[model samples]
Target: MLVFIDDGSTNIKLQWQESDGTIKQHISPNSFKREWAVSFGDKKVFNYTLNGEQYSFDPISPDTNIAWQYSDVNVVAVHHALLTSGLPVSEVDIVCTLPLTEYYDRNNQPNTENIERKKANFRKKITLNGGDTFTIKDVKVMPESIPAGYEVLQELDELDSLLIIDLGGTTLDISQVMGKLSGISKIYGDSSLGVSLVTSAVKDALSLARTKGSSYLADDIIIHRKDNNYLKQRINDENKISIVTEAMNEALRKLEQRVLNTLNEFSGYTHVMVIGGGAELICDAVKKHTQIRDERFFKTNNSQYDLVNGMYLIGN
Candidate 1:
């Protein structure tokens, strides 16, 4: 089996192709319990404990630092994926992605020569807390934007120079793709401009609404709502939805300008592809700001899973 895991700041997505030509997917919240308990009855059960509550959750922690490979949470996520895969732990090839800047600097140049060596450091035997041991047959690491570009370009009949803007939770990764097979031009990224900033803007708007006797949780404010009239009415009445919407638009505009400025530095890029979890939130702004609203602009439907699906195709 070929397993691909897209480990993002907000969620971790898993996809794999089975021997019977079946593709399976699993998604889990990125948050994980720091402490856990194991029950040894007729069967052993792994339980995550937090704040006097126990739930069936993984022990994986969120890895936010640039050195994600060194974090213990990375391994925990791999274990979680294998256990949930419903397949044998042995003889599986794994492919994962890393932040663009952390993986390379510009145009696939290794910021440090040791970067490639670090990928194999996580390919050893792992022992889970449940007393199960597993060995990964091999591991491959690629920049997050590369797989995204591959996934999009493969759908095209003839490949051309393209730009991929991955608006993720922690950072926005930009990569230039010139071909379908090994045609990455350059990669650029910024940590200040991400979808989380838009989420923060919404939370700020909701906080003011709370003072006006509105009871809306920050998580409840789904940014992309097409059919929820009740929530829309509440937002309009209390939260000043226009103000919040403007704030989000302004934030995305700045990000779009930054991307446009970077795009000007390169040439022969015929198309711009926007993807990642944040793609849905800033899709219109990207197209508007770029002023490239022709057939050249492509946005993903399920932005969150594109990277993992790209990983699967790359592995195959």
Candidate 2:
């Protein structure tokens, strides 16, 4: 049996096969912390134990650091997805990812030490406080953004020299490939470069406003754009809204310029593809700049799951 997990910092996406020969997928916020806020033992929310301590999945206080892949929160979060899966197997092979920076070093070679660290993370034991003590038979950690490149290439004909701009939560992974990972001319991992740039600035703007609001509130307003109610309920104010808008636009300009400059540096690709949760945030600007006559640029309709599902396809 096999399971694939795209354990992202902002979210975790899972794809696996069940007995009925159907593909299954699961996704949840990357919300886990060191405390168990359990109610009745009967309720049984997701919880776990590692190294004789307890941790729980509580969105009440989201621990949304872009923590490195080998941390305890990430380990338990992936386990949370697996245990939640309730796959009817005692052992299973798993495929997951490492951010481009961790997967490749400055020399553009595989960072074996870092890759091995992520493998060892799952290869270690889990108590499964929720009691699904399954074993990971084998684990494959691919570069986070490349697997999706292969997945997208299979959809088109004669598309080569492609550029993939994967806008992750806290990092952006860009790659220029000859064709379907045939040969990568460059793999540029923009460290500390992502959507958080906008969200964090918005949060500051909202906080500095006269009314205090949840930092979490700052995120959805900018990212999901479904926060009119959120703003009204918490920190609704004309001044606050204007301030937040200013900050968001400012951050967007900087981030987009960074991406645009990167694109200028890495040309020679016939097609440009952008994927990830933050794709829509900068798609319009990127689209306008590339000006690739005809529809040579592509953006995944399902940005969040593209790479994870790609890994799943390869694993299956």
Candidate 3:
């Protein structure tokens, strides 16, 4: 049996693998989340509950809305789930993924400053938990990168030999897959390109191109374009073709360049796989920037599950 934890910036999922090879997934919600409301004078009331029990306390009431600040509850939820999983500590092996460069910093090696701080944070959590008997692996982008559209490549008979380009909310990861578990498979990544940049650019361009309206979030607002009702209306009304196209192109160009630059270092690859949610959104941009023109780009629906599934495959 193995437990896989893939902790991302916005969410954390806990997966359990049984001896019979069944897998289960659970999402974590922060237990310590609270909101402070001013009661009387300098006193503020904080109401929060955990496990169906209520807990309340009046801490120093800051004049501002400082109640929103809280620690990452995903860590706590993962720990709790493990303790109650009914699996022996010795029988369970933890397989977690980290940024490729960040992996180096956690091992006490020099790396990029941005990743060093992030990696250090994760290492601190593992150390504090006393779960010392675990393995932290850097994401191997090679094997199956295109989680959404890779079926096309498999149909073309290139599953054994292909390249992978993985895009995420924060980074564009690229890796080369050579032979099925052969001698050595090449790996590469670019950390700077992400979805946040695209969203930010979208908002900025929306404001300038569309008719300005009442602002929220101190100049920023979260828009769920896919599932949002009001936001969809707003984008349709405000975001005209001229504005949307320009913003989309800018974000795509940035991402496409990252993919091209990473793939340029390698050659002799016939099939290219594009994986990740954001990559599916901007597939055209990726093709324009890649030198592997002969290589067909494959996308897979299991793209998001690549790393964890890979861990499951390798762990068991």
Candidate 4:
């Protein structure tokens, strides 16, 4: 069995694969702090301070202790849950995706080579704590890598320049690929868009509404109601869908230019594939404005599985 893991910017997910083509999955929060060794408040290992309180990760410390809370601590919680659940499996293979480039300067600007080296170092640090008996795979293809997924679609038709927008949990990655198989396929990306923005926007609006004490505000209504014309208008007036849309657009605009600059690398190519969770939400804003042959929008279904699936494909 192979265990595929997608360590996303927002969360972590795992899938246990079987030879029969079946799989079981698990998900956990993103606990960046937990990656480091146990926190400390004192020596002797009898007590410690975390977030300004006495605590212990040691099993024999005590029972019924709130100091043991692991809500925001993802890796530790998930790892413990696995062992407690009495996992019957032995072999575990893991795959992961990472934002290879840095956006410290904002926009789709490329980072100095030094920035990526730092990222690689941090990744190595985390993997060590993740511990033994598993394999880890990371992609270096940038956001365009997700669009490369559309390579499956491109084989179905002929085409010219294509664009792909990938709205990630914390960033927006857009790419324009050109050329035929083994011909030319250059990729570009950004990390400034998508769901995180929408969620924030929604939360802010909800906060304001709460102040007004609108008794009619149901969580479902606020989240799913299609008739929120007032919100839509605000989005349109801003020339972005809403907070999510604007972030998507802002990212897309930057991506558009990057794509243009990279076009030369893929001179004779045609065909485009847009992907990621946010693609469906802000499709209209990033739609292609130029001529091309074919277009594909990849909606994330079991997104956590994509990298590993791609890894398995690569291994084979």
Candidate 5:
């Protein structure tokens, strides 16, 4: 079986194809706690016993630190992705991803050592939450933003250059993707930029307004379709809504300035677009700030799954 896993830090987006060409996708939060955990009563949580100890899955927390690509918890998240996909297998080939910074070096060369380490990271058999173990027949660690560009090539001008602005949870990965493997060019990235910044701003604004909301709820506000009524109903305040909106817009403004600054550094990319979890949030900013015509600026419908879908399309 062929599988493409975009093992992002915030959530793992999965895509796999069947022999009949049917494609299925799934996503799971990459958040879990190792100890001092209690499972929800009656509700089934994706809890696993690791090394004879109990581990539990839950919503992402403010202090979650499992972003390290090779963390055992990350392996658990990958295994959870595979198990939740309902793919039957004892061994399978897997395609995975790495952030742009880790995938390429300062001189625009392949980061061989890190890439090899990531490939070996998932090699061992992993015990599932409530299922049997499986082995990796093979693993391919590709760069984050460019594989997404291959998917962009599906209906667009392949020979034209693409600039991929991947708005992630913890970082913004911007890369130049040309065509296939040979087309990827100068990659620019910074772990400091991403949706997390906006999320944090919303949280801080609430606190400044003398209102309280969970860090998780602040993240919800960043989404385009968040239910303000439900959140306000839950919080009971008028200013909170205004606070959140103003905070989000302010933070987004700063984010756009910095991201645009990065984009200004590059030259010659014919098409530009935003993808991943924060794409919708950043799409408007790109359009408004770039002054590039709408036809020249693009948007990915697949969002978070775009990168994995790209890898899966090229795998077979």
Candidate 6:
């Protein structure tokens, strides 16, 4: 089976077919730390409970100094994928990605020789518990933004000077492609901007609220957004809810403004596309502020899944 994994900054998404001829998609929180000698055993605290042990990780910051492929978090993510598959351990073709700028830096520009070394690192044998081994027969890595752009534009007709805005959990990548993946003209990125910041802002505001003396995290804040009455009770104050809502709005406003300014820089494009978890949140603002004349704004209906789903086309 083809295993397509998008090991994103905030969440790890996997797509594969099970042995029973069923398509399975899994998403795990991207938060992870080194497993030290800490007696943690609360299944409720983590999203993944494996054999009575909690294995949830806290979110990590965007750091260029660390390679995620070598991180223990990645190990945990792959472990989950293999365990849940219910298939015997065997050689599989794996497809993953790096950010656009990082991929370009390591492959297109200086340090181009590093690409082979990185590929070899992924192919190394990974042994899990119970004497099981997960082996990768082949691995391919590409720019994270390219698959989403290519998948979206493939449904459209002839294109010229296309602009693709990919807002992810940890970074915002904006690029102008001329014809195809190889026709990338110019690319720009901002590491500090992402959808997580909006949730972080709300969590920060919740700290001032009652919060039942319980510390609030980004995931907790996300839960509150969907559960209004539960959050109201947790904060225990309507005024505090107002404060959190205002903070979320302010964070979104700033993101919209930045995207608007960036959109102004890339003109004369025939089509514009936006894809990411954050794309839908800022779709209206992007549509309103985008100034490219007579061009249509394309927001993939399956923005979050499109990237990994498109990888199927490559893995096969």
TM-scores vs. true structure, each candidate:
0.74, 0.82, 0.53, 0.51, 0.84, 0.77
Model 3 agreement with the true structure over 34-93: per-residue lDDT tens digits? 332435667533343333343332222111011111123333334444544455444344
Determine which window of 10 residues in candidate 6 has minimal summed lDDT. Answer: 208-217
Better of 3 and 5 by lDDT: 5
| Candidates 2 and 6, the one with greater TM-score | 2
Return the lDDT, model 6, position 42.
48
lDDT of 6 by residue, 213-272 (tens): 222344455446656787776666788777887888798888898888887777767777
lDDT of model number 5: 0.74
> Each prediction's Cα lDDT score?
0.64, 0.74, 0.47, 0.40, 0.74, 0.64
Error of 6 at 182 (Å): 5.5
The residue ranges of model 5 lying beyond 4 angstroms of the native Cα positions read 36-43, 49-54, 64-67, 88-90, 151-160, 179-183, 204-216, 225-236
Residues 1-316 of candidate 2 have per-residue lDDT tens digits of: 8888998887788888778888888876666667766777467676678656678876544222335588877777777777767566378788889887688887667899988898988865667653666687799899887787786566534546777888877777788776756666788877667876776787678664311234357656776454566655565586787677778888889888888888887877777788887887778777888876456787866887888887877768
Task: Please give, for residues 113-168, the per-residue lDDT of candidate 1 as tens digits.
Answer: 43554455455344555445346667777668778667557654455767788888
> In terms of lDDT, which candidate is stronger, 2 or 3?
2
Model 3: CA > 4 A from native: 10-14, 17-93, 102-161, 206-236, 239-245, 285-296
Clashing pairs in 1: none
